[PDB]
């Protein structure tokens, strides 16, 4: 680690020679890396909210008319035993008696009970709904296994379009970080025409030319990722302050999950490696034009 001292030494004064351009080329590239972090913040907080808050795929299932006053407990006990629906909300015949009198007064008697069916997210497909309709109907004492759909048809269709457009935006941003690193590094290299010629005409090794440009690209990507993380964290705090007054009408305390430590290391290492390969592609495709 003694011959690599000079390669790390030269890039520091190379960047510090013109400080405003060095600041500008990191400020332009952190705000290009702000948006994958912002989209990742937007993605991962609505996903944990999607576990409990909005989706509740209940299917209104009616029991037999006057089979028994406590026949729903047997349905709960038998539906606990199979896959798919595990937890069943206990709604007996006396539950429907107390649950249907208020609706009549709000709008203006056998009364079979209404069961609660939750297929979670592994059997939420409409093609997989009919598989769950087979086991409920084949159990005796159940008359109406009536569909609801409507809102559930919209819930099972718009999520595909939102996932597809988010995947398209994510692919376009991973192409953007794949390309703006290479653009910035290759303009930094093509700003220097004399140096490669001087260290190549003088007897050397190709790795000696390769090392300082590669280290400069690596530290440029490192600085861009660090400034991107610092600029994203204050926006996460600003949005936490923006959602603090919105979450108090939802009835529960809500907070935004920030940039975790296990992914920031991955972001820094992929920015270092993309600076590595950007400087490799910028320098190898530049010193092949100096060998006649």
């Amino acid at each position: 680690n003694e011959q690599v001292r000079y390669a790390f030494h030269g890039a520091l004064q190379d960047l510090k020679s013109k400080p405003f351009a060095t600041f500008l080329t990191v400020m332009v590239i952190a705000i290009s890396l702000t948006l994958p972090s912002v989209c990742y913040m937007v993605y991962k907080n609505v996903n944990q909210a999607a576990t409990q808050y909005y989706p509740s795929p209940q299917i209104t299932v009616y029991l037999q008319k006057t089979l028994d006053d406590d026949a729903a407990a047997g349905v709960v006990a038998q539906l606990q035993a199979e896959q798919g629906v595990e937890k069943v909300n206990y709604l007996s015949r006396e539950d429907a008696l107390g649950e249907f009198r208020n609706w009549s007064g709000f709008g203006g008697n056998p009364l079979p009970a209404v069961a609660v069916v939750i297929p979670k997210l592994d059997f939420q497909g409409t093609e997989s709904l009919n598989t769950l309709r087979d086991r409920i109907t084949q159990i005796n004492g159940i008359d109406e296994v009536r569909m609801d759909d409507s809102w559930f048809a919209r819930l099972a269709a718009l999520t595909g379009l939102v996932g597809r457009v988010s995947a398209m935006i994510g692919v376009l941003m991973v192409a953007a970080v794949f390309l703006v690193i290479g653009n910035s590094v290759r303009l930094s290299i093509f700003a220097r025409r004399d140096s490669i010629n001087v260290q190549k005409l003088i007897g050397a090794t190709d790795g000696f030319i390769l090392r300082p440009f590669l280290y400069g690209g690596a530290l440029l990507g490192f600085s861009g990722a660090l400034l991107s993380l610092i600029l994203s964290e204050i926006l996460v705090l600003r949005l936490s302050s923006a959602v603090a007054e919105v979450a108090q009408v939802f009835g529960t305390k809500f907070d935004i999950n920030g940039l975790s430590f296990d992914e920031c290391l991955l972001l820094l290492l992929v920015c270092s490696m993309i600076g590595w390969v950007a400087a490799w592609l910028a320098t190898v495709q530049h010193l092949r034009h100096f060998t006649p």
């Binding site: 004399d194 001087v198 190549k200 003088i202 007897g203 050397a204 090794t205 006649p292």
Partner: protein
């Protein structure tokens, strides 16, 4: 031992800069090759180090032939030639002290003997007070001087010259020529290529002249 036979050069436009030249070159002996303005002397002068391929023919260097070889072999043997140029290929961003320290850090010397080697390679040129500064405020009379100061580093086996004394006085030409003359005490060749006729008339060495890239004037 540098051996020549019929070698030519036609880069892109078919301009026959060279067509063939044949001379042996003993180790330690000096030379003063020259020509006219359009004469192909600098291309021949670069064929020894061989940063371009010599097209037809082949060039023998020491005990090897380097005609069309790989890029993992040519810059290893490029460290033994004293590359100076007419145009000033110098690092404009970096200062003078590490312009001449490039062969030192390629050779991988320790950091303590860099300073005495550079000062030993600059006191005979005569530039220590005008060191540790940038070449953009150095005029050509010392820019050409610090250009050749990296050629005298680490005692190359063969030393090359691409028109020195272009921006120097005749007294400084004589001083820099006596700087070049003391290298002939050891086994390194001198390959001066100057247009000056009174400087080479004051001494007798191996004088050859190429006339428009063919044969020997």
């Amino acid at each position: 031992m540098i051996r020549f036979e019929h070698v030519s050069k036609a880069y892109l436009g078919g301009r026959q800069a060279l067509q063939g030249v044949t001379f042996h070159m003993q180790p330690g002996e000096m030379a003063f090759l020259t020509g006219h303005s359009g004469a192909g002397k600098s291309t021949l002068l670069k064929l020894i180090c061989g940063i371009e391929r010599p097209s037809a023919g082949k060039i023998w260097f020491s005990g090897h032939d380097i005609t069309r070889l790989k890029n993992r072999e040519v810059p290893f043997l490029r460290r033994q030639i004293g590359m100076i140029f007419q145009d000033h290929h110098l690092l404009m961003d970096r200062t003078v002290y590490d312009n001449v320290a490039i062969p030192l850090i390629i050779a991988g010397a320790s950091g303590d003997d860099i300073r005495r080697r550079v000062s030993a390679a600059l006191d005979k040129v005569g530039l220590l007070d005008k060191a540790k500064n940038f070449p953009i405020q150095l005029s050509g009379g010392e820019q050409q001087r610090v250009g050749i100061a990296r050629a005298v580093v680490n005692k190359p086996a063969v030393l090359l010259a691409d028109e020195p004394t272009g921006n120097l006085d005749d007294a400084l030409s004589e001083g820099i020529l006596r700087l070049f003359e003391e290298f002939n005490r050891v086994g390194v060749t001198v390959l001066m290529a100057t247009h000056d006729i009174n400087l080479i008339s004051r001494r007798s060495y191996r004088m050859l002249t190429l006339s428009d890239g063919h044969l020997h004037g």
